[PDB]
Amino acid sequence: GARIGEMKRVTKETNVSVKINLDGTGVADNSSGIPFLDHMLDQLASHGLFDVHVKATGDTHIDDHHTNEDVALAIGTALLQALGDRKGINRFGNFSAPLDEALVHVSLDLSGRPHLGYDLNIPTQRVGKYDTQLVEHFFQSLVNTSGMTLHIRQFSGTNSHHIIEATFKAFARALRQATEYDTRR
Amino acid sequence: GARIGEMKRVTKETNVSVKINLDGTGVADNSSGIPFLDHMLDQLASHGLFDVHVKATGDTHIDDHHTNEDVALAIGTALLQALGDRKGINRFGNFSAPLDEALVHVSLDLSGRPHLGYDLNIPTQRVGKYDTQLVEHFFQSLVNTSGMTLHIRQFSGTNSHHIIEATFKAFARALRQATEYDTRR
Amino acid sequence: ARIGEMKRVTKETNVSVKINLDGTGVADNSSGIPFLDHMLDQLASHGLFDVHVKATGDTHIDDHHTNEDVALAIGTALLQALGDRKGINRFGNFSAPLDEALVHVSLDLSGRPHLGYDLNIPTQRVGKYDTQLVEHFFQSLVNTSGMTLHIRQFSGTNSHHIIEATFKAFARALRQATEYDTRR
Amino acid sequence: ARIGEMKRVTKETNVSVKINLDGTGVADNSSGIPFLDHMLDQLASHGLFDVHVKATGDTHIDDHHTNEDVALAIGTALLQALGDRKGINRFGNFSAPLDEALVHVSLDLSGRPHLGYDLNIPTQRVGKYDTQLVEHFFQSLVNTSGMTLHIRQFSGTNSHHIIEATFKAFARALRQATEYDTR
Amino acid sequence: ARIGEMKRVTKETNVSVKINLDGTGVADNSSGIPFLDHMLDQLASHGLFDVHVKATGDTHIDDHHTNEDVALAIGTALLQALGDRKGINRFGNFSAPLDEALVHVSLDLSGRPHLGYDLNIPTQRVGKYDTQLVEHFFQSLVNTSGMTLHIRQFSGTNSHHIIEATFKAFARALRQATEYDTRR
Amino acid sequence: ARIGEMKRVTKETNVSVKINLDGTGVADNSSGIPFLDHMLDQLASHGLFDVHVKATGDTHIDDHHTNEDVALAIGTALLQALGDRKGINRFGNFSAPLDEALVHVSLDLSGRPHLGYDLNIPTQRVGKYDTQLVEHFFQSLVNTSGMTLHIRQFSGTNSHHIIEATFKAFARALRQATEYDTR
Ligand SMILES: [Mn+2]
Ligand SMILES: [Mn+2]
Ligand SMILES: [Mn+2]
Ligand SMILES: [Mn+2]
Ligand SMILES: [Mn+2]
Ligand SMILES: [Mn+2]
Ligand SMILES: [Mn+2]
Ligand SMILES: [Mn+2]
Ligand SMILES: [Mn+2]
Ligand SMILES: [Mn+2]
Ligand SMILES: [Mn+2]
Ligand SMILES: [Mn+2]
């Protein structure tokens, strides 16, 4: 069957609905209220071959922080639900993704023990309207609810959009590897 | 009885109305024209158990500075009015508040002598649309009209929203302690 | 009374934990690691928790797996005992001196795990206990309890004093956080 | 009420101290050192102790011997008042601002004496009071009371403010440590 | 089979290239530069490409023009063989050891040319081959293939080892990128 | 199945090793060194090798000779199992995290021995296991297997985590290198 996780999370700050298919075809259906995060979630779908559905409304008139955090939390929980007992999967994923001058390596373990090692050097404070501090917070929150070990390391890069997008491409392809089944097991 | 302070302050730049209940239940009713400041004033209510009512219109088309300053000034005066003779209260308040990776300590004395010692290190210039320089100015203006001694010290923190929100949480809980009655007196 | 229980059996360890947040300081700790037992006793005596920990494990390899699985189980029991966390102080703060050592702990039963760890332990072993396991104990406890936890050493030169002051401060900060806020 | 009393007569000093741990803030301090009297008053006012200190001594030499013997007697009086120390909070913590100064005090009525002292007092005299005597006051008090005491300055430029904030923080930390743990 | 061919004749050089992306490792390289031939052989043996390169040029001046025009022609042949690039892995990564040398290559058949080049080659000549030509080879190949290419040396002291490890890693990363993604 | 077996008896040690390159993760490790047994188990679990190690030795001196002779025998057993090394991937690469630790392993079953070792293990003992023996284990394994082996730590503060991540990465890199290149 297909491993699908779903989470609806409604707080005073945000209203979030997430659906992810680990065995998808790359369907991207993201409307988080944060356009740049939508663009990154689209890359998660296209490069991981996940089906990624995210719909959120939130207090973005304050800033994007609460929406960003609650979407990441919901995605992490949906990933955890889809993974189930995690029997027979590769479990580990590794990928170095270039995007022009940027190069970011991601290494991860669907271990059940949350840890984020974050070593990006994003040189500007905003990409579009998106606060670049929210990139670290997105992956921290996703790690916290999914229970994964996640290491993100920038080897090259000067354009903030390129650095962040390379991160999502590498994360997407590393996560695809980790979630795929180990045929020898 | 309940200690309630009220101040309406109308200038060429701003029109401000403030009502604070030191003996409240955490009612938050904040519409300052500055959404991030509203969010921080909500935390003042929820974490201090103050009832906090703030309504302001102002020249936010110039920037948020005048509104931020006049709201803080009015709040400080309302706090001073609510405190009265300050007989029998704890007078001093201390609290260290974490918010994820951030940790901010606040120490204060309802002394009648204004002083702000401000030692935050906010790494970005805007949270949402809110100019992070306005955090220091908010507490300076509040100190000036309330007459309190206020020390704010950041021990940890990398996310600007977390640092500022931890500051308001610690301030709220320190102020609650300082305003509560000393039963032994 | 808010009581949490967790029994966790792996190929490496067999762990049973019961904690009473509204206890009287009953300490009943046999983790297989004597120094950790001594620290868990302080949790009970200084936090006024009832703490029951029983574990066997592959300590012939090292104390790592037992230390980790005990901490994981305690965090889950703490989360279970806390329930909806309604009406509690939620935050706790305490600076504990122990002779020349002074350690501050600040914590929030927020549901969001984070460990900020700033101890400077000068030796590698207290008794047989590997001092690297102190950080791993609190990291694992944070991961299953959902706590925000900051530990900062302001003074200290004896490793036993530094670690014990940490547990005393943690115990008293956790007691404060779990107690009820009368106004709420 | 938990009252401690100590009369200490040396060739240098004649000191009488009485402290009520369960007092109301009664301050009656005449040590022969006016600034120390002001500080002991803050101990009563902010700790809600009743503090009676009367001393004569060889202040024509300097204030050192009087300062030392007063602190020794206070520490003994405090220990006597504490008794078996059963049921008390035992630990005390407080950060006290005084304008630009901010001093944290953490203590444990442990029975094991230790002073950790980290003030940065920028002048040598407040009035006629030698600022070296602040450290010696707390060291001697720790020696006879047997308490663990940590004093840390986080802010401060005025010597009077720094020292007064220290006594305010010490008084409130000591009040917390001597009070009963209701649970 | 995806086969690319390019014949490029200038006043300086006469170059003919044919590459089979779905080959068996057939190596047929006579560029006029023996060390480059040795490197192009590794492209075939380690990438399982069929690589045919024949060039004559003004090597009596130096190897520069031949090196550049060979690399330009290979990049064009690679682009021609790739076609619409539909359904392929697109990205390739490989770290190749060669004794003490270790070189990582990461590439994307993105269509956007970029060379990130971080080798530290300690000598100026391997045989008769000027080691400045290594960077120019990959820069020229990137320019005509439309590839994003990052080359990073993690270890290495022998220039022949460093350069050969680079071509082995490039060959295996390129093989991965050109192979088909079964799920797509 | 590709099985290698080596029995090595010195005046210091008596070692028997059997490895199945095409195994299912069967772990049967009794080297006399409990932490090394734990690491060899990870080799089986994460590499899907069948790993049988039985050794007795002069561990009353220290673990060095046992550690060394076990690694030598494993390297020989691996080489014997590889045979002509025809049709295999030959190269292996893997980055393995373990909580805060992250270790990359790159190797080539080249026949030319080399160890490039860049770990930063912050303590001298994990349990009773001397952490100097990690480098010596891989150096000896390289010497008898003839492999090119590069080990690089990118992150890590806990010695147990760093060493375990190294074995996980080595096991998965070795699995990749021994598997058949289908094309
Ligand atoms: Mn947040
Ligand atoms: Mn883009
Ligand atoms: Mn202004
Ligand atoms: Mn917020
Ligand atoms: Mn561990
Ligand atoms: Mn002890
Ligand atoms: Mn003296
Ligand atoms: Mn004064
Ligand atoms: Mn040129
Ligand atoms: Mn060669
Ligand atoms: Mn040796
Ligand atoms: Mn282990």
Residue numbers in the entry:
A (entry chain A), B (entry chain A): 77 to 261
C (entry chain D), E (entry chain D): 78 to 261
D (entry chain C), F (entry chain C): 78 to 260
What does the paper say about this structure?
Plant HISN5 catalyzes the sixth step of the HBP, in which imidazole-glycerol phosphate (IGP) is dehydrated to form imidazole-acetol phosphate (IAP). The MtHISN5 subunit contains a four α-helix bundle sandwiched between two β-sheets whose four strands are almost perpendicular to each other. In solution, MtHISN5 forms a homo 24-mer with octahedral (432) symmetry of approx. 110 Å diameter and a total mass of 540 kDa. The dimensions of the MtHISN5 oligomer did not change significantly after the binding of IG2, indicating a lack of major conformational rearrangements. The active site of MtHISN5 (see below) contains two Mn2+ cations (Mn1 and Mn2) bound by residues belonging to different subunits.
We also obtained the structure in space group I4 at 1.69 Å resolution with six chains in the ASU. The crystal structures cover the MtHISN5 sequence starting from Gly77 or Ala78 through Arg260/261 (chain and structure-dependent). The structure at 1.69 contains FMT, GOL, and TRS. The crystal structures were obtained in the presence of formate (FMT) between Mn1 and Mn2, which completes their coordination spheres. FMTs primary location was in the active sites, between Mn1 and Mn2. Consistently, we identified TRS (121 Da) and CIT (192 Da) in the 3- and 4-fold tunnels, respectively.
